[PDB]
Structures are given as structure tokens and as C-alpha cells.
Amino acid sequence: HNDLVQLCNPHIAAMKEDILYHFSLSTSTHDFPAMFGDVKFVCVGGSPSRMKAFIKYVAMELGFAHADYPNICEGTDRYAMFKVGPVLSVSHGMGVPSIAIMLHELIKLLYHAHCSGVTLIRIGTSGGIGLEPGSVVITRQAVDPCFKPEFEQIVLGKREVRNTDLDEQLVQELARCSAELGEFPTVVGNTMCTLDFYEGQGRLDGALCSYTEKDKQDYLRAAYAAGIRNIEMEASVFAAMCNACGLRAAVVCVTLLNRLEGDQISSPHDVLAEYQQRPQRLVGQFIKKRLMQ
């Protein structure tokens, strides 16, 4: 049995209208069950254009192809959203707080639509550590910049922490799907999630930087030693919030560069757009496989 989507906030049951402000959707103007009740896979990534390309790429592989793919979030540009069959594709921008909003309103949408048996997957990009550019990483543990699998949030002035473990079973399943493809290297490892892309990640090419290359290396290698294989900016909340709500979730990012050799993203554009299809492809394999049982 596929369990219903639950919230962890008793206030929503008691609201006469629930306005999903950043989606430009509302219970009083939209029928959630009719629009989303059949959704089973939610896919989320930073760029809206990427997540559109995804809903197109994926429609083709389940034979939905032809067609136009309307943005469900018309009347807003905070987030883009697309649906095809049981697959929802939603952008989330960059950074913990941007994705945190998307998730808050997303989960509520699933709860309103009365969805059940949903899987959430982040298809992102990252920087790798001691991996060839182009490798995809399936996250076991989202980790903070001190390598603790914790996510910290300040509520009413007090610090609260939730665990950022990702469903073990799903990472092993994803592992298998990538192999069925045999198209690109894929490892599982821990993902370090930061709040800054430059100083936040040992980079030497920001506007500010009070440290040396030798300092960047020491830090980055220490991270690798702790089981860390890539670096991005959303894995923590994603893990934390899904766990908080009992949702099955996973994170699949391609690395765009090996950080032990550089900071700047200087691959030909043609190569970087290939890199970014890898996670879409992998997740493509996962959904197709799942819809055959």
C-alpha cells in the first residue's frame, strides 16, 4: 500500500484557504486532487529551463510524446512547474532558503492533492572531489561544511537540528539504474551542502578570499577523507524536510568540475549540456523501471 502524504503542521487542516504564494496556486481557485492526485514522481532542480527539458525528455521515454508543455506556474516567475502523467517537474532555484520555500509549498500541494506513494528526487549539478568531471553522485548523506549529517535551522531564535540521512534503499536502487545505462561514471558518496558558492566552498575566485590554494586543498581533501564526493547547495534541507515528513527522497547530481584541480567552470558549453542530461537520463531510467510493476 502507498501511504498518503502527511503534513507536520496541524494549522493547514484548519485554514479556509491555503495560498501557495510562490506557485501562484490556491485551494480556493484550484482543484488539487484533480490536478495532482495521480502524481507519483516529483523531480526538482535549480533551473526552470532544465526542468522543462526534463519533462520533455521524459514524456518521450514513456511514450507521451508528439506537444506543448505548459508552465503550471503562470502568473509567477518564482518557480516553474510542469506535469506529464505521474511526473511533476518543479524548479527550485539556488540555495537552501530558495528550495526550502519550494518544498514547503510543494509538500502542502501533495497533501492537498491527496497524493500517495510519492518519491522526491533532486536532479542537480555540483562540484566533484577527486572524480572525473561528468561523474554523477548519488547522495547517501547530505552533510554540513563540518561534515556532520545535520541541518540547522533557527526557529523563533532557537537553533533546531534535523538529521540529513537519505533512504539507503533508494540510493542502491538508483545505483542499479545507472548501470543498466552504462553511459557515465556514477558513485555513491556523501554530499556537502553549503550556503555560499565561493568562500562557502573553498573557491579562490570570488570577490573576497582571505586564504591560499594550499588552504583550499587541505580542506577539500579532509572532506574527501570523510566520505564526501561532491558539493552543492540544497541537499541538506531537502534531506531534512523529506525526513521530517516521512517522504522517500533521493539526490542525484552531476559534477561539472573536479575541485582539486580548479574552481572555474571552463568546459565547452557543448560538454556541459551533455553533463547535465546525465542525471535526467538516470532518473528517466528509474521512472520507466518503476512503471513496469
Ligand X SMILES: O=c1ccn([C@H]2C[C@H](O)[C@@H](CO)O2)c(=O)[nH]1
Positive or negative torsion for Cα 201, 204, 205, 209: positive
| Spatial distance between the Cα atoms of 190 and 138, rounded to a whole number of angstroms | 8
Residue 232, binding choice from its own copies, ligand X, none, Cβ under 5 to 8 Å by partner class: ligand X
Helices 235-245 and 96-113: crossing angle, nearest 10°? 30
Residue choice 24, 91, 119, 125 for contact with ligand X (CB under 6 A): 125
Residue 231, binding choice from ligand X, its own copies, none, Cβ under 5 to 8 Å by partner class: ligand X
Q: How far is the CB of 128 from ligand X (least distance, A)?
A: 8
Residue 286 · residue 170 · CB < 8 Å: no
Q: Quick one: DSSP state of residue 167?
A: -
Q: Select the span of 1-9, 57-65, 134-142, 177-185 touching its own copies (CB under 8 A).
A: 1-9
Residue choice 35, 62, 94, 260 for contact with its own copies (CB under 8 A): 94
Q: Which pairs with CB-CB distance under 8 Å and at least 24 residues apart come from 69-77?
A: 72/23, 72/25, 72/35, 73/23, 73/24, 73/25, 74/24, 75/24, 76/22, 76/23, 76/24
Query: Interface with its own copies includes 233 (CB under 8 A)?
Result: yes
Q: Which is nearer to ligand X, 64 or 197 (CB)?
A: 197
Question: What is the distance between the terminal CA atoms of the chain, rounded to a whole angstrom?
Answer: 14
Query: Interface with ligand X includes 141 (CB under 6 A)?
Result: no
Query: Interface with its own copies includes 210 (CB under 8 A)?
Result: yes
Q: Which pairs with CB-CB distance under 8 Å and at least 24 residues apart come from 25-33?
A: 25/72, 25/73, 25/109, 27/112, 32/109, 32/112, 32/113, 32/114, 33/112, 33/113, 33/114
Residue choice 142, 245, 250, 251 for contact with its own copies (CB under 8 A): 245
Backbone angles phi, psi at 52, to 5 degrees: -75, -55
> Is 194 flagged in the annotation as binding?
no
- Which residues lie below 8 Å from residue 87, measured CB to CB, with a gap of 6+? 39, 40, 41, 43, 55, 58, 287
Query: Interface with ligand X includes 280 (CB under 6 A)?
Result: no
Q: Select the span of 32-40, 62-70, 88-96, 163-171 touching its own copies (CB under 8 A).
A: 88-96
Q: How far is the CB of 151 from its own copies (least distance, A)?
A: 11
| Spatial distance between the Cα atoms of 57 and 154, rounded to a whole number of angstroms | 39
Residue choice 13, 34, 67, 156 for contact with its own copies (CB under 8 A): 156
Question: Which residue's Cβ has the minimum distance to ligand X?
Answer: 127
Query: Interface with ligand X includes 46 (CB under 6 A)?
Result: yes
Residue 127, binding choice from its own copies, ligand X, none, Cβ under 5 to 8 Å by partner class: ligand X
Q: Select the span of 26-34, 79-87, 133-141, 228-236 touching ligand X (CB under 6 A).
A: 228-236
Residue 220 CB burial class (10 angstroms; 0-12, 13-18, ≥19): buried
Query: Interface with its own copies includes 270 (CB under 8 A)?
Result: no
Footprint of ligand X (CB under 6 A)? 46, 94, 124-127, 197, 201, 231-233, 256
Footprint of its own copies (CB under 8 A)? 7-9, 11-12, 15, 17-19, 21-22, 46-49, 75, 77-78, 93-98, 100-101, 103-108, 111, 145-146, 153-157, 194-200, 202, 204-211, 215-216, 219, 222, 233, 241, 244-245, 264-266, 269
